[PDB]
Structure formats: C-alpha cells, structure tokens
Amino acid sequence: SASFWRAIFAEFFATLFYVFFGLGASLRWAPGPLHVLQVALAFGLALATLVQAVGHISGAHVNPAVTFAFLVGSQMSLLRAICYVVAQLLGAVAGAAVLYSVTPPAVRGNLALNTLHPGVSVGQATIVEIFLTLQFVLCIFATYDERRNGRLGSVALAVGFSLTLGHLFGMYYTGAGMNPARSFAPAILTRNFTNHWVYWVGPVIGAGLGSLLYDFLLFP
Amino acid sequence: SASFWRAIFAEFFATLFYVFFGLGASLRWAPGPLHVLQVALAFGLALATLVQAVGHISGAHVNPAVTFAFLVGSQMSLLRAICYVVAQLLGAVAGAAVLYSVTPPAVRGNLALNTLHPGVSVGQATIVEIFLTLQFVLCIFATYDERRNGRLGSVALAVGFSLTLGHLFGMYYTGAGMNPARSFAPAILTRNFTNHWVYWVGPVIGAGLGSLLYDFLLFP
Amino acid sequence: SASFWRAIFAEFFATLFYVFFGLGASLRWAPGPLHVLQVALAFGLALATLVQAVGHISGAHVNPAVTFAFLVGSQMSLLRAICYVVAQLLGAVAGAAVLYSVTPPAVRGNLALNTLHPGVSVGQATIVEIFLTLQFVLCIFATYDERRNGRLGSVALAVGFSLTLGHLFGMYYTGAGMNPARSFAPAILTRNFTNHWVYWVGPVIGAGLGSLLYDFLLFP
Amino acid sequence: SASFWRAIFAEFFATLFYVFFGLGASLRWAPGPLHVLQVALAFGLALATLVQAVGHISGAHVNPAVTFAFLVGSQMSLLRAICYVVAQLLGAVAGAAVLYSVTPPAVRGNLALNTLHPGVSVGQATIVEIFLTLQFVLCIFATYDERRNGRLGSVALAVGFSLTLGHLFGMYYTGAGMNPARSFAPAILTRNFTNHWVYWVGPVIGAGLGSLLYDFLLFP
Amino acid sequence: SASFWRAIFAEFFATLFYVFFGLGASLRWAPGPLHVLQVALAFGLALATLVQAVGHISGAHVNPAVTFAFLVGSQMSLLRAICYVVAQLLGAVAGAAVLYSVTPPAVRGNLALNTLHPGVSVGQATIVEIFLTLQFVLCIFATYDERRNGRLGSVALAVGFSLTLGHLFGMYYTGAGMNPARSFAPAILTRNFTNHWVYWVGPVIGAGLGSLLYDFLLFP
Amino acid sequence: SASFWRAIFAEFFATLFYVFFGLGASLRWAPGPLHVLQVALAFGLALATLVQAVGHISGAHVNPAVTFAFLVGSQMSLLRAICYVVAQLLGAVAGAAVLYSVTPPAVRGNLALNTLHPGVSVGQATIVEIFLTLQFVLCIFATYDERRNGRLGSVALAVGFSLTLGHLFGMYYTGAGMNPARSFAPAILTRNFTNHWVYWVGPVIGAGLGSLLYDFLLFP
Amino acid sequence: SASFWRAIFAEFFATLFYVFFGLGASLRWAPGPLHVLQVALAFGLALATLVQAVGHISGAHVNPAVTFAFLVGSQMSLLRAICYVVAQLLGAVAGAAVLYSVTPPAVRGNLALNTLHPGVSVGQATIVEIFLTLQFVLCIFATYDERRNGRLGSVALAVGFSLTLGHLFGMYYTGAGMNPARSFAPAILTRNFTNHWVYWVGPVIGAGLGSLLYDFLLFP
Amino acid sequence: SASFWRAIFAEFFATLFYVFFGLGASLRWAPGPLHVLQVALAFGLALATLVQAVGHISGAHVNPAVTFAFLVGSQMSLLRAICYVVAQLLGAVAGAAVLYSVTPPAVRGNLALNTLHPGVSVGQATIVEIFLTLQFVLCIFATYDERRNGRLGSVALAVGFSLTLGHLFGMYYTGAGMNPARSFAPAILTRNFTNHWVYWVGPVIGAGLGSLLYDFLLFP
C-alpha cells in the first residue's frame, strides 16, 4: 500500500501549506486597502500550485468537503475518505501551528478565523458556504473528469481560480470558509468555535450538491 | 431530447451562479479602494469556472447576447436560442433572488444594477456596450472554433479574461453590462428599468457585429 | 491575395480595440487607488483576447515594434511589414478616436498619453522602453516559435502577461509605451508630441534586440 | 559545448531581467495602496515570461536555490550548477545595476532590498524563506517533470504563480526573498548585508527540502 | 428696513455658497479613498467661513431647520423666519445651479443628492437626521448665546465642527442632509424627490428638539 | 437643587450623544481606507460640540474617568461624582442602544467594542489607556482651570483635540477606550466583557495620575 | 518708512514660505490615496501660521488677489499695493525656486502647476476661481474688520480654513489656484503658461467681487 | 527655585508625551493609506495639548531647537536653556522607551526614526529641516509674544498647526524631524545615527534664523 500512504502524506503536506500560505496571506498586517482580492488570489494560487504538485497522487483535495464530494461521487472508498479528512484536519492544524510560530503576535490576529459577518445569519451564512463549495466542487469534478473528446485547459489553474472566485464573493459574508479544515485550524488554535458548524454544514452540503448536480444533472 | 434539456438546465444553473457570484462581488460592501479590478476578475473567474463546468454541454453562453451571436452565427437553431435566453433570464433572476436573500439589506444596494455613468449619454453607452460585447463574442467565437491546425490554449480562461477586460473598461461607463440577463436580474428585482434598453440594444448589436466580423471578415 | 488583406484588417481592427480598451482603462476616472495593476492587466488581457482572436491570421502584432521585430527576424516581407504598421497606426488612431467620442471630456484627460515621468531623462526613458519591448518581443518570439519537442502553454495568455509585466514596471517611468501605435494615437489626437521619439526609438530598438537575442543567442 | 554556454547566457540574461523587472516593480514609487499584490504578480509574470523564453535551454532557474535544488535532485552536474549560480549572481547584479541607472534616486530607495520585518526574528525569517522556496521548488519539480500519463497545463504560468504566492505571503515577513540572487543584487549595490544570510540559508534549505520531499516522498 | 433685507441677501448668498462649496466637494470625482472625512470638513469649513462672514448680520442660519429652531426658540419673528427659508431655498437652488454649470457632467453625478443608504429605513433615517440636527442646533444655540460669565471660544469654528461631526456620522446613513435647503437643491434640479420628506421632517424635528432641550432643559 | 439635576441630565444626554456619534462613526461601514483619522476626529468633534453645549452646567465630563479625576482633584463632591458616573453609564448605554436601532445590522459589527489589539497584552493595554487618559485629564484640568493671568484659547476645541490625539495613538492598541462609559456601552449590549477591566483600570488610573500630576507637580 | 519696508519683506518672506510649503505638499510624491485633503490643509495651515506671524505688520496678504481686494476696498494705497504684488510674485518664485532645489526631480513634477482639469473649460475654470477667491476675500475682509461689538475668534485660523475650503472644492477643477503668485511661481519656473490667465482673471475678479459684496452689500 | 524645577519636570514630562504620542502615531501599523496627514495632525495635536497643559510654566518648548531659539532670542538664561535640553532629551528617550515597551515588536519598526528619503541629499535635507523649524519658531515667537494691541487667537492651536504643516511637508523629505529630541529618541534606542547630525544642524539653524528673522526683521 505504498501508493496509498504517499497520497495521505500528500494530503497532509498540501493542506499544511494550503493553510499556511492561505491563512498567512489572510493575516491582517494592515487595515489598509482591501485585502479581499489579495487573499482570494492567495488561496487560489496556493491551491493552484498544490494541485500542480500533489494532484497526480492524492488529487490534492486539501478539503474535507472536496474529499466528501468524491466520497459522494463514488470515486473514493470510505476508508480513504476518512484517511484524507484526518490528514487534512491534522495538516491544517499543523499549517496554522507553524504560521502561529513564524508570525509575530501583533499580526496573527485571530489567525484568520472564519467569522460570520455582522448582519449575516447562520442560515444565510450556510447558503453562501453551500454555493461557494457547490461551484468549487462543480469545477473540480468537471476538471478532474477524463471523459471528453476535447483536450485543453490547465487543471490546477482552473480549480484555483474557482477557489479565488469563492473568496472574491464569500469573504464578505463568512470569510469564504469553503474548507472545513481551513476553518478548523484557527478555531482549534484560538479556542473559538463560534458558528463553526456553519463552516462544516455549509461546505459539506455544497460539496454533496455539487457532487450530485454534476453526476446526474450535468454529466450522467 | 435528453441532451437538449440538460443543456437548458446548464444554461439556467450557470447563469444563476454567474449572476449570483457576479452581482454579489459587485455589491458595494465598502466605498473604499477601487472595486473595478476585483469585480472584473470576479465576473471573469465566474465565467471561467462555469465554462469549465457546463461548457461541454450547453456552451456556457449564460448571456442572451452570446446566445444571440451563435444564433446569428448559424451554429444554433432558433428554438434552442429562445430556450437558452429564457433559461438565462429565468436563471439570472433566480441568482439575483438568492443573492437578495443571503445578502444583508445594508450591502445589497441596488443589487449591482447596471446604471449609466453621469456624462455618458445613452448613445455613448450603447457604443461602449457594443464594443464590450463585440470583443467578447469575437473571443468566444475564435475560442469555441475547432478549425485550426494548432492545438493550445485554455478555453474557459480565455473567454473569462475577455469578460474581465470588458469590465476593466466598461464598468466606468455602464457598469459593464455585457450580459442582458445580468442586467435584467437587478432591474426586475429593484423595479428600476432606467436606460435598460441600452443593456439590451448594446450587447445584442455587439454580439451581431462580433458574430459577423468573425464569420465573414476574420475566418470565412 | 485574399489571405493577405484579411490579416491587414485584422491588424487594423485588433489595434483599434487594443488602443480602445487599453487607453480607455488607462483613463484616470479617479486619482484614487493605484491604477497601475488595473491598467497593466487591462493592456495584457486586451492583447490576450486579441491574440486569441486574430492571432491565427495576422499574428496579432498590433505593435509597429512587434511587426518590426518579425521584419528583423526575417519572418515577414518588407511590404507586409509596412502594411501592418500603417494598419496599426491607422487602427490605433481610430481606437483612440472612438474612445474620445464615447468618453466624457472630464475623464478623457490627455487620452492616456505616454508622458515621461519627472526625473526620468529621455536616455533613461529610452532604455526602459528598450527593455520593456525586449522581453516582450523575446516572449512573443519564443511563444510564436513552432520548433520545440514539448507541447504545452497558452500563446495568447503568455504574451499578454509579458505586456502586463511591462506595464507593471514601465508605467512609472514612461507610462509603459511598449507600442509606438499606442503612443501615436493620443499624441496625434491631442497635438502633444513631447518626447514622442522616445516611444518610437525605445520600442524599435528593444524589438530589434529582442529579435536578435532570440534568433542568434537563444535559439539559432 | 555550444549548447552549454548558450544556457549560461540564458541564465545570465533572464536573471538580469528577472531582477530588473522584479526589483523595479518593487521600488516604492508611492507609499500609497498596498504594493504586495502588484509586486507579487510582477515577480510572477517576470518569471512566467522568462520561463516561456529561456526555459527550453537553461530551465530558467534564475535562482541559486532553484539551481541548488536540481543539483540536489541529481538533474544537473556540479559544474553546470556552479556555472548557473555565477551567471545568476552576475546577472542579478547587472539587472539591479541597470535598474539603478534608469531609476531616479528618489524612487530607488534601498533598491528593493530584502529586509526582515520588525518582530520577525532571523529564525522565523529563515523558516518563512524555507517554506517559500519549498513550495516553489515543489511546483518547479512537479512542473518540469516529464513522467506523467496526463498532458495538460502551462509550465511557465504554473511556476510564476507559485512565485507570486510566495510573495503574497512572504513579502510581509522578509520581502519574499525566495531568490538568493535577487537578494544579493541590492545588497551588493547598497553595501547592506544585514541578515543577508537568512536569504541564502532559508531558500537553500527550502530548495533542498523541496528537492527531497518531491523525489522520495511524492514521486519516487 | 435696510438692516432687514441685507440679512436676507446674506442668507441667500451664504446658502448659495454653502451649497456650492458643500455639494461641489461632495461630487464624486473619484470612487477612490473615503470621501467622508473630506466632505465632512468641506461642509464644516464652508459653514465656518460663512458664519465668520455673514454671521453678524443674519446669524448665518443657511438652514431652514436652523431658522426653524430660532423661530421655535422665539428669537426671530415668524415673518423673518419665512423670509430666511425662502432666501435659503432660493439660494441653495442657485448654488447648485452654478455648480451644475461649472462642473463637467461626468462628475456632477446626481448633484450630491441626499439618498437613503440601503438597509436604512425612512424611520431610521428620520431619527438619524433628528440627532444630526439636534446636536447641531444645540451647538448653535449654546454658541450664539450671550448669557455666560466666561468669554472664550470661536463661534464660527465651533458650529462648523458640529456640522462636520454630523457628516462624519450621518453621511453613511442619509448623506448627512442636516439642511433641508442643501437637500432641496439637488432634488429640484435632478427631478428626484425620493424619500425627500425625510430630509425635511428629520432636520425640522431635530431642530425643534434641539431648540427645546436647550431653552428649557439646559439653559432656562 | 434645580441646578444639580440639570447637570445630571446634561451628563446623561451628552454622554448619550458622545457614544451615539462616537461609536457610530467608529462602525466599520467599510474595510477600506484607514478609519483611524476619521474616528479620532469624530470622537474629538463630538466632545468639542458637547463641551460647547453642556460644558457650562455639568462640565461635560461624559467620562467616568474624567468625573473620577475631578473627584480626585477635590473639585466635586463624592455624591455628585457617583451621580455623574451613573448618568454617564446610563447615557452611554442609551446612546449605543439608539445607535443599535438606527444602524443596519450589517454595519453594526460589535458596536465599536474596545477590543485589545493582537500582540498587545493587558499590561501594555492598561499603560496605553493610562497615558491616553493622563494627557486627556491633564488637558482638561489645565483648560478648565480659571487661575492664569492670560486669557486666550477655546476650551471645547482644546479638550476635543486631546481626545482626538488619544484616538490617533490608542486606536491601534485598544481602540482608544479613554472612556469607561464609551467602553461599557457596547460591552453591555453585545454580552462581551473580554478584557473589559482594562478599559476601567486604565482610564481611572490615568485620570488619577493626570489629576495628581497637575494639582501637585504642575500647578500647586 | 521703516514700518513700510518691513511689511514688504514680510510679504516677500511669507509668500516665499506659503509657496514653498504649499507647492511642496502639493508635489505628488505618490499617486496613492487622495491628496486633496492633505494639500488643502497644507495650504490652509501654511496661511494660518503666516498670518499668525506676519499678519500684524503686512496683513499677510501673500496673494495679489488679496492685495487687489484691499486696494479695491480702499484700505491700502496704490503704491503699497504694487509693492506687495511685486514682493508676492518675487517671493513666490523664490519659494518655488528653493523647493525646486531641495526636492528631487522625480517628485518635483510640474512643480504643482495649476492646470485646468479635463472637461473644465476656461470659462468654467474662471468662475470656479472667482468663487474660490470671493469667499476667501469675504472671509478675510470679515475677519480683518475691527468694527463689531463682539470679541471672539482666531483670525489666522479662520482665514486659513477658508483657503482650505477653496482647495477642498477647487483642486478638482483648477488645482485651486486662488493665488496668482502661487500660480505664477511654477509657471515661470516650468515655462508653462497654458491657461495661466485664468489664474489671474479668476482670482482678481473674485477678489473684487468679494471686496464689493462685503463693503456695500454686507457691511456698509 | 521651586518655580524653576517645576518647569524642568514640565519640559521632561511634556517631551516624554510628545515623543510617546508623536512617535507612536508614526509607527507603521499599516503600509496602507497615506499616514502623512494622520501623523502630521498627531504631532500637532500632541504639541497643542501639551502647550495647553505645561505652556504656562515652561513654555512647552519640548524641542532643543525651540529652547535654542529662545536662548538666541535672549528670553531665557543659558543655564535654564541647558536644563531644558537635557530634560527634553532625557524625556524624549523616556517617551520612546515606554513606547518601545507598550508597542508590539512587529509594529515598532525603527521606532519612527527620522531617516533621509532616497534622492534627498544631506544638504537638501538640512535646508528642509531649516525651513521646517524656521516657520515653526516664527510661529512660536509671534504667538508667545505679548506685544500687540490686538487680543485674539489660541496659542496652543496655532503652534501645533505650525508643527502639523511642517510634517505635511517635511515627512516626505526627512520624516519632518523638526525636534532634535524627537530625532534623538529613536536613534539612541535603535543604535542608528545615520545622518543624525542633519536633524540637529537643520533645526538648530532654522531655530536661529527664525529667532533672528522675527526679532530684527519682523518685530524689532
């Protein structure tokens, strides 16, 4: 099972770097010009380079929702799916842990914790997180799919830009927590789980809907 | 006709998400730093991920002008063209409806309504909207074309960047309403159709000119 | 000679739109947040969509320097090279003319005229314009080249990003006038040719050096 | 050995332009809106166009760490590795020298010198520089690798975006000196080597770890 | 009645300049950095210089609410109060008329029309306008009062800063229309009276409450 | 005791408006350009107009620390001091209550709650709050003092600018909570008293030190 | 005539410093956040400190228009008026000359030359400059007037804030050239007198109207 | 000599707070929007509140140059002048020491050290520092002077605004180090005395020239 564990470490390392570079760029070094575009591209380019790296071996899910979507899409065994989520959660905490150690406390903040924007209820926040992950999973499933007569497009860049779009929209509502592991890492390290179920229920449903809309309403 | 209706739902869903993520990022959460670059990339990355998703099944037109261009380009029957526009219009309203329900009223604004900039007449606004959609259709037609000895380039990223360019230029004039469905959704939900014909006449002509310049003056 | 004139109109139209969307985004609608990144991507995405459109028929030079480089690179007859430059110059003026007609006079400014930054001498400005066009031509020649065992990369996106890089650097010095036609259009329409030779000598030399460094010091 | 020296000049020229356009965009023409996103894309698009140019002949390492990684990865002889580093260091100094000559002294500053952010110790700065170069080398090694059944993606754009990500994160800590040559050029020309070993130890270790994690823990 | 009419022209001219310089600075020449602080000081310094000019002859009310407050405070006859309001309304329209003639149409906008912010109901907007004018009248009444043993403070600067405070707070809600004449001028010249009663009911009540809280609960 | 209770209502109303206009301007309507200067002037101009209004009757303390300082300075009986603090606390809650009712929930946030900046310990935060209130009380005591041969200066403007200075410095550390009532109002209405003792211990000590440094080390 | 020449040197020195600190702050060190508020306060605080310095001896006119207004107001002999204008013009050139020598050429620009904004005709620019100087002279005449029963207000701060208001409004139109000497200094040192008569005709008329409106329609 | 030492402690404490609040606001918490206006008002309002506090007892010099000017102006004995400078220097170090202890190391930076801007030579920097302190001393001497028939103006606000003007202009050149004590405090605590003589020679000469221009060329 050498090819199995190498993918688990790939999911561990890539999620570590995804959270490290993702949360790190999200750290408010400045209350100055709008960080939304910078952070959105950071998460996107982070996912783009990691899919380009470990995408051929683990799929570069780096997201319990994404792993949940392939589990729903019947493209991964239950066991491997639990293995990825643990590796993603364990890696996300590690990435935010190293980030906590290298970042000065004045700019660590709440470690880029996904908090609900004022005026955004948990019901509205859940729907936003559903649609954020729905399009994201839809893009992943349509991009990772090998069934098409055409042959064009970069996989890592298309999926990363879908994540960038999710942050260009969702950062104002929920901080764009389209990744339960990315949401779990600052919560576990700051002892703040306020409305944290939104960042699990939302993306998981959005992953399931994106896994279902594609498999039976877009490409049977 | 299973392959027919699946494309209609694809045009419905993708236009829904195109307007949801497009108008949502356009919502002025802040009168702060310039949102033009953020919104332009949002619309572009929104169209990029949707072409990457439903582009193989419906073409990912998500634009009555774009559907009008292929109708002019004789690459789609009249019936299917009317089906797409209804699906696009119905989907755009739905996307802006969900956006209205998840966005707090303080940041909904006019729901990112395409309004004419002061000092920009309806004649100047129409021309801007023509050239915005002309290059956009030109890019789509040159990108969706299968007739070339070369084999390179990502389809979804080229078309999305053409839409981004249109917003990098047209947002100052007309809000860059290169999509009558994207323009119809906030107008129907805010009861504001001021100069709304500009966002239909403009893109439709620009679509026809782009469909004609390509088919008979660029690639006969 | 049907295939000949269709490329001339392609060079005319694309340069028209290159200047229209390029200069238009460069128009200072606001002295607010830094426009450099917005304008740099605008010119780049403008060139990217135009190469994606008319690149298969005229090469999408839209630049007398670029046409000069292929003339130096012996990949185009003298006659066709003069035809392109006239079409580029004539198209650039037309693009800036339409832009002048659709843009309100309060935001037309000097029509995005390439002016030398204070403290930047004409000798320093020439060198900057040389290096701006040198890398730009180097990217074009390496990208348009068909001689390589590998097969990857998007042509239109690589060349457009090279132009974006040139504006990310050169806009502070000379406004990044890496295109004599783009520099000629506002000069002819504003009656301001101050230091205008810099935007011809600079890019032409940079085009020749880029055409020479590639053909005899990079890929013989 | 004609194919050998042509790669050395390629590493010399490309590093010259990498530092010229990289440091030049990093020059604080304005203490205004956040330059991080602009500079990050500048370095990335600079590396993207140079890989697109001289990548087929020298690999477009333009980085002693990257050359060190391939030396560790056993994909380059020791001799050629020393040749590249000298060409990179010599080219970086030349690029910053020309930049010094064309940039007015008021905006040269410290020539974009990689300085440690306050509150960031040399130990934290080293780790940040390790992870910056680790993912960067990981992306390069996974992208330059010819061993995969799939066939998609643009090489120059994936590696440049990895460098952009490194600056989107590392510019706040160390200025994102993921290139000892890019760090050596302003240090040698400003007589300021404060904490300069961090920008050599950091990237070199990060290059070795990225060269090792890929070759024996990701793709044996 | 020479001393009477000279005060009427003073109220006419000063309100003309108050609206001219007030609305003019409020004109969105740029969607860039936050204009709230600039506009708030503009209205304040406008009122400060006008009180310094015509304050000794008409009181420099330049506000139907302020004139209403002194009418409530029994410090002005009914007739003179109607004379001021007509002079203020007539002057405000004239000031916005000259501003319309000297400002290019691209930056006139809606002529700085006091519009209700999204999510701010007419009931909330009325209360904000009450408190804006309440403190403003309180400051005016306490400053114009001659009954105190102390002798210090600049009258024109204290009242202008109270108006500045009202815009520092109220511009986000209602545009800080603490002056029915300032609100009437763009409404009458743009044919837009949407929620215009809020900018009359609000300030008038706030003027009456400020005239009552001072005369019988602060200084009997 | 008519002159007694009228001062209590003055302390109630002015603190209500101080918190209403103070917290309201502090409400993050935009994560855009730096709000520090806007908020600092808002609190200052708020205190300036209120001292200009109710300063002759209650002293316009609107701050339990300021009332504590005069209690320490032996210029106010214990009873009246407790009366003011209750009126200030009761008024502050009322001001933030009305602000909560008129402000949309999307821009209410945490109601401008004084939170400690990351990296600022409670010991450092206390000292900052001491020095913020120390200079503030020093300015108040030196300004309210009637013992000097000179006769110049505006009282309300000098004290308000001292509060502005405190926010120009202290907003980055503790949000500049130089007023326990201003700090108590959002805490009691948001159920968040995290580190709230810092905003009481800090200002009270700073008030006592400022009351002591002036009375026995500056003006005996 | 010792008291005469000391006022001439006062007008020479103060205008020198008015232009030095005024134009210097207007020098675009950064195309970043809006400089209008910074420059407006700079000119205002510059005039405020100079009136506080040399106002008791020369009146601190530092403006040919202001000197023209007192010449119209019959408060100064013709001879002394010509003496001031020469001293102001000579001093303004000297102030901009020293500024030229101490400011690096990269940030000197056009030496803060009053240029007409695009879309602002010379007729509209003249009217703006009239109203800018009209209120400014009105404030000066009402502030320098000794005929009033009241006794309050700071002279230097009221006049400086009137100049600040003029720049808060006029900088977008004409750069707020309310001072022909301030407009003459960069024009004579840059050899650029384009539309320079606007900055003489405008302020002089505005000075005459302000000198007439005050003397015969405001305070006979 | 009780009245003597109380002024020394006043100069010690006020300079401590002047540097504490002055340098603290100058600390770059954010590389965002332009801090020049914020810092300029901070130093000004800091000096304004301190003159309002300890101005009646020590003069609130808080500046070795200002103390040097009164020593030149023959308004203070040599001994008292040395006493003030030691108290100012000792107090400045203490203020920056407390600031160092309360500010997190990530935002301490170089403790707001007055460094020369690139392209500004030590000769140009000296002249700028001369004119910065010259007008500042001129304002102080004209404001502290008791010889005038008029009676108006606030002393503390006029002098603080003169310091604000000096920072509105001088911060771009030298950081506006118009106070050798303010310049000495971060230099002694950061071990960085690069070009530190400029911040002593400059202000001292500017103080002497301002002390001489006033006493013998403005008010004999």
Ligand SMILES: CCCCCCCCCCCCC/C=C\[C@@H](O)[C@H](COP(=O)([O-])OCC[N+](C)(C)C)NC(=O)CCCCCCCCCCCCCCC
């Ligand atoms: C909060 C709690 C967190 C707890 C975190 C604990 C993480 C522990 C992770 C343990 C993973 C252990 C994996 C070990 C072996 C597996 O690979 C598994 C064993 O197989 P088997 O049953 O012995 O044989 C069947 C395979 N084959 C090919 C021989 C037929 N699969 C493989 O063979 C693949 C081997 C891949 C080896 C990669 C080794 C990397 C070592 C890096 C060391 C770095 C040290 C750094 C110190 C500072």
Ligand SMILES: CCCCCCCCCCCCC/C=C\[C@@H](O)[C@H](COP(=O)([O-])OCC[N+](C)(C)C)NC(=O)CCCCCCCCCCCCCCC
């Ligand atoms: C400031 C001064 C500016 C002056 C600008 C003047 C621009 C004038 C441009 C004139 C170009 C004229 C091109 C005419 C024909 C050429 O294509 C040339 C002729 O060839 P030949 O010698 O007759 O035959 C040998 C070819 N073949 C295939 C038949 C063997 N080549 C071709 O055949 C290719 C034909 C492509 C035709 C494209 C027609 C587009 C028409 C669009 C009209 C739009 C009107 C809009 C009004 C508002």
Ligand SMILES: CCCCCCCCCCCCC/C=C\[C@@H](O)[C@H](COP(=O)([O-])OCC[N+](C)(C)C)NC(=O)CCCCCCCCCCCCCCC
């Ligand atoms: C939309 C409709 C808008 C209509 C706007 C119409 C505005 C018309 C304003 C008319 C105001 C007329 C005021 C006329 C005289 C009053 O001063 C009134 C008369 O008094 P009485 O009954 O004759 O005598 C009892 C006074 N006394 C001292 C003699 C005992 N009071 C005075 O005496 C005060 C006189 C102040 C005169 C100021 C004259 C300024 C003239 C400026 C002309 C500018 C022309 C510009 C052309 C381009």
Ligand SMILES: CCCCCCCCCCCCC/C=C\[C@@H](O)[C@H](COP(=O)([O-])OCC[N+](C)(C)C)NC(=O)CCCCCCCCCCCCCCC
């Ligand atoms: C969370 C719990 C919050 C509880 C908040 C409760 C706040 C209740 C405040 C009650 C204050 C009551 C003050 C009443 C009278 C005092 O002025 C006190 C009595 O004196 P005495 O012992 O009867 O006579 C000795 C005085 N003299 C001159 C006659 C010799 N002092 C005075 O005389 C001064 C009178 C000042 C009266 C101001 C009346 C304002 C009324 C405004 C009503 C607004 C209603 C709005 C409804 C929507």
Ligand SMILES: CCCCCCCCCCCCC/C=C\[C@@H](O)[C@H](COP(=O)([O-])OCC[N+](C)(C)C)NC(=O)CCCCCCCCCCCCCCC
């Ligand atoms: C582009 C061409 C620019 C040309 C610029 C030329 C500027 C030349 C300015 C010359 C002003 C000359 C002023 C000379 C004297 C006047 O004060 C005039 C003479 O009066 P009178 O007729 O001799 O006597 C009747 C007066 N009293 C009291 C004695 C009864 N009035 C006075 O008395 C007031 C005297 C005030 C003297 C101030 C002297 C400052 C000297 C500063 C020197 C600095 C040198 C720096 C070198 C680097």
Ligand SMILES: CCCCCCCCCCCCC/C=C\[C@@H](O)[C@H](COP(=O)([O-])OCC[N+](C)(C)C)NC(=O)CCCCCCCCCCCCCCC
């Ligand atoms: C890096 C090296 C830094 C060294 C810093 C050392 C700073 C030391 C400062 C010492 C100042 C000593 C001042 C002592 C007394 C003077 O006031 C001097 C003596 O006069 P004389 O010769 O005894 O009598 C002639 C006066 N009279 C009226 C009685 C006729 N003048 C006075 O009388 C004015 C007295 C004012 C006293 C203010 C006492 C404040 C004490 C605050 C203590 C705070 C402790 C905090 C601990 C944490």
